[PDB]
Amino acid sequence: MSHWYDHAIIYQIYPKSFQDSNDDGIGDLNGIRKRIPYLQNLGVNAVWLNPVFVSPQVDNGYDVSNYFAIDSHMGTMEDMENLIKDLHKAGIHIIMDFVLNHTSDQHPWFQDAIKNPDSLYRDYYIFAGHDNKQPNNWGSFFGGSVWEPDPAGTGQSYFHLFDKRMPDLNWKNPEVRHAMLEIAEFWLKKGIDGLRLDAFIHIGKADLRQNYPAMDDKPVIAEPFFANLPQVQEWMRPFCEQIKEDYPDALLLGEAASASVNLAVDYTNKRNHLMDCVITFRYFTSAQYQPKELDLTAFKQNQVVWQQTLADISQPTLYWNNHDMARLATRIAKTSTQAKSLAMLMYLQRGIPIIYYGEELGLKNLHFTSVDQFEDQTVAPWIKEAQKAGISRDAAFAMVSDTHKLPARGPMPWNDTENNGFTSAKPWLNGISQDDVTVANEVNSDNSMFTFYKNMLNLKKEKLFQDGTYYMISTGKDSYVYQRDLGNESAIVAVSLSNKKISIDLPEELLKAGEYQLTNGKLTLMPYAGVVLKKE
Template sequence: MTKKWWQNAVVYQVYPRSYQDSNGDGVGDLAGLTQRLPYIKRLGADVIWLNPIYKSPDKDNGYDISDYQAIQPVYGSMADFDQMLATAHQTGLKILMDLVVNHTSDQHKWFQESRQSKDNPYADYYIWRDPVDGHAPNNWGSYFSGGAWTYEPKRGQYYLHLFAPGQPDLNWENPKVRQEVWNLMRFWLDKGVDGFRMDVINLISKPAGLPDAPVAPGAQYGNSEPLVSDGPKLNDYLQEMNREVLSHYDVMTVGEMPGSTPEDAIQYTGLDANELNMVFQFEHVGLSANPDERLGKWNDQPVQLIDLKRSLSRWQTALDGKGWNSLYWNNHDQPRAVSRFATDDPQYRVRAAKMLGTTLHMLQGTPYVYEGEELGETNVHYTKLSDYEDLESLNAYHQNVEEDHLVDSQTMLKYLAHISRDNARTPMQWDATANAGFTTGKPWFALNPNYPQINAKSQVDDDQSVFNYYRQLIALRHHSDLIVYGSYQALDPEDNQVFAYKRHYQGQTLLVISNFTAESVTRDYGQAQASQRLIGNYADDAGTTLRPYETKVYQFND
């Protein structure tokens, strides 16, 4: 296996709207990010994944792009981007852009032309179908609630949008569309960006004939995901993308792929394949879905540890030597990790955050740290609908409570407080001053009220902080082929309290033990015979005793 730079890298994700405002308008921007690059470098990260900064009507916070080659004015100018990119490179940081090409904004010039008539040059840039008996062409539901088709009177046809009506899906069957995508990719790569995170890239190939999707009992629309994920021409399109664009640059690529299996991922990320480097899979973050299929992900139940271990172990084992994993607990679309997978109880939050970081960073793959995760930031725990901003969350409330009457308002609010995307989108908690040091103006979105207790300034110089623990984890990975490349061995998969596993590489063994509970338990994995303890979230080592949320990593030299 040829070792690649991105296998040894750690990625830090920046949601620019919420990271750092430089001009007092209450919205994070590129100049603000530039100011904070030394902080990211101090953490030890190698790559910054930047959520979309392109021109957009912001119906979905930038994932509805109206111009791929222009900067959203609230984030600054192209000169600000160029300055940020140059400063990042001077600092030793690479920049990963968000590539959103399953769909555009309905304000994009392509769609504005396409909607006019069936015979203009952009007519086939999107997926249009005639009505069937006066209704939508099929029963597909949108990821953001409601139907996936919207009628356009000018054409007398429906257009497909797997997400919001303002996000029409591109027609990848059209070679002109693919050339447009290759051109916009080259535009950014020629500027010097270091790769792409590709938004829902496995949805770009739609099934022939666009058949109806299965419908859960009592549901209004069909679940299109099994039909649209990993479509029949996805490999062809990704291979063409690699051939035309990616193979000409030394870059990193990660494809977001809802619904993909390890077997799918090996096709796209095979170490000898010519497509992508790795995928974002959703299996482990989808484990606590509601038993009522009509409610989908909306639930407030904790993830069961046995299920979590089974999922992560499956991906570790399947991709070893064949593909490459991305490792993440949270991002801009997921709630805060410590609240979801452990506890944000102030008594244990710090240890729990360190425990989750250890469990993830010792796995095989490239770790991703979402802004604030390195501080142990928590869910915000909103209690009323007016607190929310996220389109997906608001649509789900209206559909599940007001339209379909599946749950009452208080139950749905509990679900939102547990799993809404807005939990991750509150402004970054820099210090204990007004607005957490994020802005001198009125923040675009309310801060998590715990920022006086949880913030970067209180942690960067504290040896016992979550921030400095993450620094240690990242430094360990940078200096250990065992951590980066070692094969994975699950231990006690049916243990519902402790997540333990081993990694093996060239005569060395790593043992990772993490207690996911607030109880003290005893487990003996032969740690007394270890050559050394590499890291742990308690100062001392209690041997076979695991204290609340304790994690520890041992190395054995054969």
Template sequence: MKNWWQEEVIYQIYPKSFNDSNNDGIGDINGIREKLPYLEDLGITMIWICPIFKSPMIDNGYDISDYQDINPDFGTIHDLEDLIKEAEQRGIKIILDLVVNHSSDEHPWFQEALENPSSKYRDYYIFRKPSNGAPPNNWRSIFGGSVWEKVRNEEIYYMHTFDKKQPDLNFENPELRREIYSMINWWLDKGIAGFRIDSITFIKKDQDYSSLPADGVDQLVTCKHKTRNRPGISEFLHELKQETFNKYDCVTVGEAPGVEYEEFDDYIGEDGYFSMIFDFKYADIDVESGSDWFKRTDWSIKEFRDLLFKSQEAIQKVGWGANFIENHDQPRAISKLIKDPSYQNYYGGSALALMYMFLRGTPFLYQGQEIGATNFTRQFIEQFDDISSIDNYYRSMSEGFSKEEALNFVNLRSRDNTRTPMQWNTSRYAGFSQYAPWLEVNENYDMINVASQEDDPESLLNFYRLLISTRNTSTHRDTLIFGNITPVYDTKENIISYYREGSTETLQVIVNLSSDKTSMEIQSFTSIISNYENIQNNDGSITLRPYEAMLIKLN
């Protein structure tokens, strides 16, 4: 069955860093409105906006203190309604971030739970008594330290999977669930197209709350074993879908780490909980665990390719995928996936773009990805805003690494890499604002920016425009959106190639993801897109230059 959201190209906006319309150093909703012509010109059809709800911004909006109000830094509900309306006139839909595993500790529910232990709101969160005078168990939070925080003046702890200012909501409580559903439906009634759903696999906890063997020098163990995608979560997710999403023609994109491939049918199959999910197995190739950045891997292109193909094959069996190489929690793809620094430019960026843009599924772009934004290099830990970066810096040193090594791990993996202000032009603060921004601009903004690429036909920005229009409006549209995908495994190790098969044509993507020249046997073809000027075709084989990428039609 074909669904409307399979045809979208989605652009993720980190509102705090996209465009500042009122010059206070913080991006805002009206800043997004100002850039709608740019986004329409890029060809995207939907915007996913990271959280703009009322929040103390401890985790940049993923700590919500009022689900039905907008944080004043970003504007007002009316600004959002105007954005939805104006975007719609340009053929662009809006989805918001849904964060329901936890709230802010400043949410009225939690404040009431602390103030009044006998109030119903105490059961909206997870409170447990100490174990032998210590926290209830030895689980480590995703952001480091115990998942338990002691309540002042009471012999009791509350649980937080993430930061201590993000207490977990208690999904075992049906009344809490009903409140959440009512809020979700309120937003859908406002005319948004759906939600990207944050950390949703954490809403079910093992109810024994038992300790496990420690896995670090802090004598704690990652909470993932007992809090992520646990037995019984299906009841919560089915109910969530029935009470909200099923009532609307909306799209839902689950952030679903910890879901094994054999469970994909439950998540995105015909009766799955969501329209599509993000798969992180290939995205986190550079680290052993997404929350332990000091456990680096020495990955190969072949390993990356095999993970990518495995993901595509698992998704294609049951449903639809959300394809991405960057987001607000990942470093910049060019810096992470292009191993030769001298190709962390147009060639590396265009090779990655072509490689993932034509996979089967809905492509997601993250702001700045289309101009080839890169990681930064910070000299001091004080230059970081991200709580996860600060935690990993100190955890790395507690695990025996030096200050320099710890800073290097953080520079490589920091979530601030993709949160630096969008690089619009060469003016001070990169055209993001006329006022010093909340986070330092990347030092290379005078080289990498929208203005310098806008009218350059050879730029990465215009290459992305070409890819998007080819997928969405060319004669190959049906094949590139709905066609089957068949990975090609018998190539040289640095080559990523796959077929897209439609009813009347077979297309092939070929990407040399290395700085070595290499060759590949090929049948007769017609070129559709290439990131080099002419394909070096030698009767039955092609020579691939460093980071050469192409989409061809087999004759």
């Protein structure tokens, strides 16, 4: 059999910034329903929306306090059932972020164990200790220890791998494993078509009695003790198999952020009955907020390694930018021409494109003043360093605004009405919006970024670019170039990464996507440009 997701094309929405439909300045699900026409015109066949479960919003809703309802700002279960009905009527699927490693301190289960030390929900989380002592030196990704002495408070301590308020689930206890399955099945019965299984690599944690020998004696971020353990695969296996059995058209898409490529195999290999695909973070490359310079050859090695090592097994995921990173323009594009060229570069390879909302319009990071807006701690102390450097106030803010995750959640600019018709009230975030793009301007203008992605996406649907093999061409270190072939038919994508015009040796030759080039047999590309050439 073949399933809908084999020929998938995914549009990621951070729904707080997509469309506000009740004038609170916060985007909602009814907003997204209003803009289904826009999505069809772009040609995306699936929407992955960010978490929308009831949640304290301590960490963009991945700190979940109730999987069975729906955050009040976003709307009502009625709205969500209708969104998944409307999208299905437009031939569009939907997939949700579902986090398997932790809940919030607010989840009923944790609230039972924090208040009853004799509760059976103490086993649903990870508790150990003597007299507010940490039983080992493991350190969280968010700072200090993974341990937090319980409020209950017996002089034990509960495990959190991230923030103190996001306690980890004990996957050893099979009562959690069924429960998480029940959450997944619940949503699949609603008719959501897949699920982004988040932080799943961390369900496995070592023998708690062990320490990691370190710098000493500060608690240490010991990935080996709580990432990619054999337990991960054995606990996921029945979880995945059960989902598949009952909902076989369901996409199970993993987050293996910075996992081994050999691990991406383990998680995606059909033999192991786990995941269909995996997002990886390994594609890419005062201290810490200085504008990023992509190590361009390193990108080429990883892009090839991944396309190659996964050729026989699984589709790679194809993405540029995100809700947790600076947008494409800003972070890496130098021009409208390169923005187009890069999208081409990445997405016409073998895989499933995941394109971030607003990337298609060629949006940039918002750019703004005041630490508060950032919802981040390190920005204040970091700006002080550059100021000492004597980089202007203006310039210091810019640098951080051009590198930080949060400026990449700008509201969609849809039109020329107030707040670009995103809302009517104060939008939940706003700043400079440097510089002004709107969907009205780009849906008409066939020169625009949008029209390029539209045409680019219709090409991607073709049997050549969906199912064909991939082979990266011998390297202009200047330029990214590769070939896609069905065996019967064949085409070459070629993209300039130089600001000076450059030349390419290749066979012969029909064009479809492209932005200014030469025709002889040898090929010359205008600066940062690129073209798709079908052979004979």
